Paper text:
To assess whether this property was specific to the human C5a proteins or whether this is a general feature of C5a, we also determined the structures of mouse C5a and C5a-desArg (mC5a and mC5a-desArg) at 1.4 and 2.1 Å resolution, respectively. Both murine proteins fold into a four-helix bundle motif as observed for hC5a. The mC5a model was then used to solve the structure of mC5a-desArg. Again, a clear MR solution could be obtained with the four-helix bundle model. In both structures, the atomic model was traced between residues Asn679 and Ser746, which corresponds to the four-helix bundle core, with helix H1 extending between Asn679 and Tyr694, helix H2 formed by residues Ser697–Arg708, helix H3 encompassing residues Thr714–Val722 and helix H4 comprising residues Gly725–Ser746. The overall fold is also stabilized by three disulfide bridges in both mC5a and mC5a-desArg: Cys702–Cys728 (H2–H4), Cys703–Cys735 (H2–H4) and Cys715–Cys736 (H3–H4). The C-terminus of mC5a and mC5a-desArg (region Pro747–Arg755/Gly754) was not visible in the electron density, again suggesting its high flexibility. Surprisingly, mC5a-desArg could activate mC5aR to the same level as mC5a, although with a much increased EC50 of 5.35 ± 3.94 nM. Thus, in contrast to the activity ofC5a-desArg towards hC5aR, mC5a-desArg seems to act as a full agonist of mC5aR but with a lower potency. Furthermore, since C5a is rapidly desarginated in vivo after release from its inert C5 precursor, our findings that hC5a-desArg and mC5a-desArg have differential activation properties towards their cognate receptors indicate that desargination acts as a partial control mechanism mainly in humans but not in mice.
Upon complement activation, a cascade of proteolytic events generates the complement effectors, including the anaphylatoxins C3a and C5a. Anaphylatoxin signalling through the G-protein coupled receptors (GPCRs) C3aR and C5aR leads to various cellular responses including chemotaxis, oxidative burst, the release of pro-inflammatory molecules and activation of the adaptive immune system. As for C3a, C5a activity is regulated by carboxypeptidases that cleave off the C-terminal arginine residue, producing the C5a-desArg molecule which has a distinct bioactivity pattern and generally a much lower potency than C5a, in part owing to its tenfold to 100-fold decrease in C5aR binding affinity. Here, we have reported the crystal structures of the human C5aR antagonist hC5a-A8 and of the two murine anaphylatoxins mC5a and mC5a-desArg.
Residue numbers in the entry: 677 to 745
Write the structure that this text describes.
Amino acid sequence: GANLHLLRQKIEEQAAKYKHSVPKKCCYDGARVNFYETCEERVARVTIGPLCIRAFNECCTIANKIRKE
């Protein structure tokens, strides 16, 4: 199915753009598969902080786009 190799390396590239651990983890969390909600739906649930929200949304978007194709 989806290129999971590419998936992991693209997410790691994105998490590396963040300075601190928590936004990195928000990235990895956003990148996890969710069959029932879009990335906007999912990130709308998160209120930890602006940088966490941004990383979550960015990595979700990256992950789902890779899955889509």
